[PDB]
Design a protein around this ligand. Structure first.
Ligand SMILES: [Mn+2]
Length: 229
């Protein structure tokens, strides 16, 4: 299967929804984690993509944040649990694909206090984390020195997040498969950073076949795609 993460930078326009649908069809992911749909909980019906009927969403009441997990019609996904943030910053979906269990946590961290935010979500969802977990999305933080063009060491709050990840036997899959990578998923006029991530259970590393970053015209973030046995 293929799993794809993208911060879409809003889906309140028909044109954005159309171009996203075309891009998804082309990429043909089994499961797609989207951040920043900007859809209100009253507007979630607006997200429909032919070929991806099962769409699980977490949304607040304003046109900000918002996350979705889309599952391909060709994927026989059998859900077992879905947990939605009432504020629209994360959604967890658990289930199986051909008798292989998978836990996916789609996260959009705020641009201030991100590593603290992510650490708190991990704590809140501690009982549902497992040895077949993927945590993906826009963490709004580096995880290691090479995740920023500046090469600054990550701060204390980020170190604390990394320790919490380590205690859960979670690793940065991208950086594990590509240790020397100086790729990025976000930029500004003066620098670049890899703030979008695929984190997962140590036990899933054996199933992780390939991962890559995908630049695109849709958003101010590049996507990350993972192929999983
Ligand atoms: Mn944004």
């Amino acid at each position: 299967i293929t799993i794809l993460t993208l911060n879409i930078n809003g889906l309140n326009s028909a044109i954005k929804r159309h171009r996203l649908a075309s891009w998804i069809k082309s990429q043909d992911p089994s499961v797609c984690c989207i951040q920043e749909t900007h859809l209100t909980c009253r507007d979630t019906h607006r997200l429909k993509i032919k070929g991806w009927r099962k769409i699980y969403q977490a949304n607040g009441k304003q046109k900000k944040a918002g996350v979705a997990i889309l599952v391909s019609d060709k994927t026989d996904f059998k859900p077992t649990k879905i947990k939605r943030d009432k504020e629209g910053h994360y959604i967890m979906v658990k289930g199986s694909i051909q008798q292989e269990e998978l836990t996916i946590l789609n996260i959009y961290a705020p641009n201030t206090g991100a590593p603290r935010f992510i650490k708190q979500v991990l704590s809140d969802l501690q009982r549902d984390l497992d040895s077949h977990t993927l945590i993906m999305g826009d963490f709004n933080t580096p995880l290691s020195t090479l995740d920023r063009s500046t090469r600054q060491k990550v701060n204390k709050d980020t170190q604390e997040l990394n320790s919490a990840l380590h205690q859960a036997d979670l690793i940065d899959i991208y950086r594990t498969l590509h240790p020397k990578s100086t790729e990025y998923t976000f930029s500004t006029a003066n620098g670049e950073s890899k703030i979008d991530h695929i984190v997962g259970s140590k036990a899933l590393l054996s199933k992780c076949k390939r991962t890559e970053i995908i630049t695109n015209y849709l958003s101010d973030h590049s996507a990350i795609k993972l192929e999983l046995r």
